[PDB]
Design a protein around this ligand. Sequence first.
Ligand SMILES: Nc1nc2c(ncn2[C@@H]2O[C@H](COP(=O)(O)OP(=O)(O)OP(=O)(O)O)[C@@H](O)[C@H]2O)c(=O)[nH]1
Ligand SMILES: [Mg+2]
Lengths: 906, 172
Amino acid sequence: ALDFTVENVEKALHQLYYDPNIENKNLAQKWLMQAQVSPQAWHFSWQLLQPDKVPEIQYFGASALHIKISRYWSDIPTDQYESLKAQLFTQITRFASGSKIVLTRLCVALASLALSMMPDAWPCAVADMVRLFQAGQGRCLALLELLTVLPEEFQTSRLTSLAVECGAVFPLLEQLLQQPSSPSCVRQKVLKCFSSWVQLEVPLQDCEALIQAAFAALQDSELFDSSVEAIVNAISQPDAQRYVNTLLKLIPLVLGLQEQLRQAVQNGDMETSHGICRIAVALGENHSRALLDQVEHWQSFLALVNMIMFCTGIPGHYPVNETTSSLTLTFWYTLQDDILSFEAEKQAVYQQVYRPVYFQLVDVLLHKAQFPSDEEYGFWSSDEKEQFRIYRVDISDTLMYVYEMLGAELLSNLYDKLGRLLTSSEEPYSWQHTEALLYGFQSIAETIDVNYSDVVPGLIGLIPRISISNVQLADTVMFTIGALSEWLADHPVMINSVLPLVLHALGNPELSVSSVSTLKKICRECKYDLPPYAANIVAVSQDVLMKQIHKTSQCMWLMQALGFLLSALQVEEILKNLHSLISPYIQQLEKLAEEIPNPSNKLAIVHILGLLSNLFTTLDISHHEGPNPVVVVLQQVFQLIQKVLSKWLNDAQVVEAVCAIFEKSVKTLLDDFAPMVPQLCEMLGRMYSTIPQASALDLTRQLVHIFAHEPAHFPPIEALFLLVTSVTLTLFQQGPRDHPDIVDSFMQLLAQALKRKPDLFLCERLDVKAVFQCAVLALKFPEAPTVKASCGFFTELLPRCGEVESVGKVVQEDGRMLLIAVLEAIGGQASRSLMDCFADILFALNKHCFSLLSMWIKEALQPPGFPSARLSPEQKDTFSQQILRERVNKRRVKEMVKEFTLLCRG
Amino acid sequence: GEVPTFKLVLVGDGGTGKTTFVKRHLTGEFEKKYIATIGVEVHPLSFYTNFGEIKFDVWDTAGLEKFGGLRDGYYINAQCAIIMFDVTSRITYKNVPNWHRDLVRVCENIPIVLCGNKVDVKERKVKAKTITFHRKKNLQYYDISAKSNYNFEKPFLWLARKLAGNPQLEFV
Ligand SMILES: Nc1nc2c(ncn2[C@@H]2O[C@H](COP(=O)(O)OP(=O)(O)OP(=O)(O)O)[C@@H](O)[C@H]2O)c(=O)[nH]1
Ligand SMILES: [Mg+2]
């Protein structure tokens, strides 16, 4: 029998924090949650905040107070407000000497209190906090903590702008910061307070003086980080562009950091170079165009560009020596977007001014992306190499966008350097410089307009002339080739100059990913000009597969590459080649088919199955993007598959593999699967009747999508559709929330039925009431994806009322339930993330069954505080009115639903 | 108990995957259901490394406000953390700053890994290029998929390395 006394809380906390027993930690935390909510918490928490106890113990006391105040306000009698206010102040004054962690939590507490009575009961909170805390250092640091945390809690509280009260905070900050006698600690806290208050709707114009102090503070090591933060938050404000005049005052201030930046780079001072870069990039990436329009200031914007160019080209490598360069990329891109954004009279002037800058940037970027010497790279940490890889991806993306603006000359310049480096000048061999240039080409190779290509042919010719003595170089060569995948399709004559190189690299285990992904790309892009290479490719592939050279993922890309290849060969050649390739695996499967139930077999079984599905994903003779080979293969394989199912029935992973085979084969041949319909339905129907799984519903949905209007083959699918719906409905009664995944596929299936073939709902063998009922309950599920699927169903249902579907409008005898479920979600029962899905249901109610909706909604909102208790009848009526307009568009219904849900929650 | 145990606090919005992640590491199976957590549930998690054994006491906190429990209070004595968000939900990401703000209030400078979960879902709504979190030395980001098992171990490896000040650590 343990009551909530200090003694027992302490024991509890000690347990939670120090007893290594897990079961015990969990037990203590549960009890501590109870103690926190108990009204004893109002007595024992002040006892925990005694100098008598350890800091983590005291902490809980303040933690409890903040939670009771911010989350159980209604349980606080008004006669307690002032005395609570006073006690928090007292303890805050006392903890100025003690733990800063507790001091913070205490401040957060007094800040919640403040925000809760600030408009009505406590008229001038901010002004009173200042007056009270004055009349020494501790008191000051305290008030600053309180004033910093206050605006932070304002951004996350639920239930009149605080910004307006900032006019009282600022004067004090200016005063404290511009005075000589203040300590560094007070100053750092003054710069942090400023960052918190700037993060609100405080006009830039009114921050100017603190912006200037922050800048002066940068030269002090102690205040640097705080200033940098305070300054970036000022400039990065959403409203900041509105005050252009102040933006003009900011340019000289940022430029004034040039010397500090240089010195910092000379000294290898990372944190500082990084700080100034962030400042400079904040000004540019946000207010670039406002600065470009103010043509009278073009000289300064130019200096700012130079400064950011300086940070991009810092000596060394990104991850290991220079964090600063990476932060300059988002800027280079916005400048490009801006330059291309105006009429030629302005565009050409700036394109003239900034073209040479982007050529420099390309030179700089190519040098920074260049790998280090083999020895150097060998000592780079695993995380460092990873960071470098991502950094290349980022540079690649920016390099691509630069090509948009430079275009033609870029490709010529690159082609020259590469060719000059390979055939004209014998210099110290650096595969690194060769790889950088090729990498530049690779990043742009997909975005080459089909107009100019004088460079492509030349480059394609230089590729076989390159030395492949390094994995990286071999990988880059391979990637460049695949990037020219589309370009080759148009120039089949060039295929011969690259295909051999790619095929060669297929055997090298270390180039698997690049090699295989390029083969696949080439096969996909030039299906029609590969027939004369098909056998050789099949030969190399089979050999490489025979030897464990590629991992299963790459093996799937191979099967895909091959499918693309065979799809353009004459029927008899497709057969002959297919047999030589799959016969062994089918036989192997047969030997694996007459074996035990061990995993080693499982792995093998799954592999062969995935090989088949991947090949059939890619092989289409009808080019949708004499019988069908795939169909025959399926027919002759079916007996084997069934044998597999019989012995592996209970295994979900193996079953999925079989499902994937057909899932993949169906999307490949859309009408030409007709012969496989009857057999597949029995299989899918038997599967689901034994063990219900979501892929079975998905497969069914695909058949429905295809053969709906094909009466000749649809009958068996109709049976399946009904059978699967009968089982999912029985299942749903029993486990209303046990299979969100199945409910999800179920809803999508039903939505496909309504989309493609509504008359399916007029079958009396299908329980239309049940379905509608399941649908509405689904709307309340925890799993967002299941709820999205549900909204999907109603969006294909409501358009079918009075659309030759009697059963459709019949279920609008239950229509007001749907409206209720939708209003409960918008009220705050569903995640804000799903709001656009419920708005879609509303839109569908207003446009297709408006008469009903209006009676429905007038009634549903009648009960006081229905969606949310936070609502007012006036707000309820306004919403009811807006949503009853007959011409509203999804765009508007979404905007009002969002506005409304916001009022319901806070 | 030849090796220490680090306190790892797992934080983030409701339904992001916190519990499913942890659970997959502990049993291997992926839970399809979303059963909100109430307060916290501390689960021990151990990994064998090429230098020895690393033990973690994952403090799986609750993302839903209504079930927050002792949110600030679970952070005490943390040696590190993991902030999680849904890559298919813009709201779980816009909230990352608030979760981070509170961890810092209790523990400062502890290593933190930010994970974007559910990247296996075809329609992503938060592109990995947007992440600016890892711009700090004790901060890192990762695209993870508790469902597809993608970058499953990355966060724990990074943290482990930072904690034992040894970039050479590798899980065995
Ligand atoms: N598609 C996809 N879904 C996932 C992934 N990880 C988790 N989920 C889904 O999210 C659900 C689990 O949500 P939880 O982890 O229990 O949510 P939670 O973090 O415990 O929410 P809180 O208790 O408030 O912290 C599961 O049903 C999964 O299907 C993923 O990587 N991909
Ligand atoms: Mg959880």
